[PDB]
Design a protein around this ligand. Structure first.
Ligand SMILES: Cc1cn([C@H]2CCCN([C@H](CC(C)C)c3ccc(C(=O)O)c(Oc4cccc(Cl)c4)c3)C2)c(=O)[nH]c1=O
Ligand SMILES: Cc1cn([C@H]2CCCN([C@H](CC(C)C)c3ccc(C(=O)O)c(Oc4cccc(Cl)c4)c3)C2)c(=O)[nH]c1=O
Lengths: 195, 198
């Protein structure tokens, strides 16, 4: 089994990359595609609060993303891993770190401590970082402040990878999507074939 | 201003103590009484998830108590403190510590780290711990309303003892084995003495 997470800002081609990579891995592996809350009842209820929340305090929002993460992990991820599946998860811990921690200004290490409470040692076996430049990302989408938030999300991701370089595999997402799909597939297969 | 929290297991007479104490203090101070979620929209929605939760993961439940705590703190507590009020809060951090941390087995220090994210340095100025024995507590529970509930109640008390032992400077332990009139008087006197030294 394997727990593979996908990270990157909007315009990184993340969603396209997961779909095509799932299509190829399913020939050789029992693989599932997921994202939080991913249909988990309690997680779905939390998602509604996040999306209905008008000017919600940033720390509350961070705790809700972490509570949805726990539910999804416990009820969806862990049982799929026990069935021997390869789990392709669209966004996990690093998304809270880059968004809530860095871009929102709470601080990466504070959002990390929160998320380590939520994941309880369950870090991904592999994390695919779709390394898109702010310029390519902006064009790939789809206002200022939004442009600034997008850049800050990317700066946050740069900070996460610079401090932790083990499970992270940075794929050049500035390339055409066919090459991003191939580089991601090859990275995954190489990891999976080494157990 | 002052941020005073009230802690204790069920059967400690907490609710009666806070209600009667508030009623006396209101005569000399600009005071409010609150509990989480305390009518805060987002906190109320979180409470519903907690209560609708069937065999819910303990860490999720802990994060929901902490998210409700943040909302209540930010929208109710902090603005009252800024207006110079005395804030009487029925259950706060220590409740998560004793229940989620200790009694539920997550660990006090882990539930503390979670709650320090939520409170962001806003610890109570004073914590009133209603020190009831498990035996007295168990008897008070019967009047106000199995072995599994008996054991959890004892663990909650043991957990509160562990918290108080490591943070004695913040707490004021009031003997809650006494009749409630004396528990009310001892709590009122403890509060007044703290408030008059401000
Ligand atoms: C996983 C994760 C993602 N994000 C970002 C990623 C980029 C999209 N955004 C937004 C933020 C919203 C308040 C406008 C977003 C977009 C679509 C959805 C939707 O599902 O419809 C969404 O709701 C979600 C998604 C995941 C979990 C929960 Cl609890 C709610 C949230 C969320 C974070 O900031 N932190 C995290 O931990
Ligand atoms: C503050 C706090 C309290 N508690 C305990 C205190 C003893 C009572 N219990 C129960 C737990 C229930 C799920 C079976 C309880 C009783 C009444 C209510 C209700 O409001 O109707 C309740 O819901 C609440 C209460 C406070 C905050 C939230 Cl989010 C929900 C919860 C909750 C904890 O375990 N942790 C905390 O952090």
């Amino acid at each position: 089994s394997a727990f593979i997470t996908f990270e990157g800002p909007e315009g990184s081609g993340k969603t396209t990359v997961i779909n095509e990579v799932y299509h190829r891995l399913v020939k050789d592996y029992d693989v599932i595609m997921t994202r939080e809350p991913g249909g988990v009842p309690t997680g779905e209820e939390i998602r509604k609060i996040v999306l209905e929340g008008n000017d919600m305090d940033i720390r509350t929002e961070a705790m809700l993303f972490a509570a949805s993460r726990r539910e999804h992990l416990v009820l969806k991820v862990i049982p799929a891993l026990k069935e021997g599946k390869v789990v392709l998860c669209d966004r996990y811990i690093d998304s809270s770190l880059a968004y809530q921690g860095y871009a929102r200004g709470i601080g990466v290490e504070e959002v990390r401590a929160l998320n380590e409470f939520a994941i309880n040692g369950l870090y991904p076996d592999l994390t695919i970082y779709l390394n898109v430049s702010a310029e390519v990302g902006r064009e790939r989408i789809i206002d200022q402040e939004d442009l600034k938030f997008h850049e800050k999300v990317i700066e946050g991701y740069q900070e996460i990878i610079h401090n932790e370089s083990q499970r992270f595999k940075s794929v050049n997402a500035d390339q055409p999507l066919e090459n991003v799909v191939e580089d991601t597939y090859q990275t995954i297969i190489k990891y999976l074939e080494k157990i």
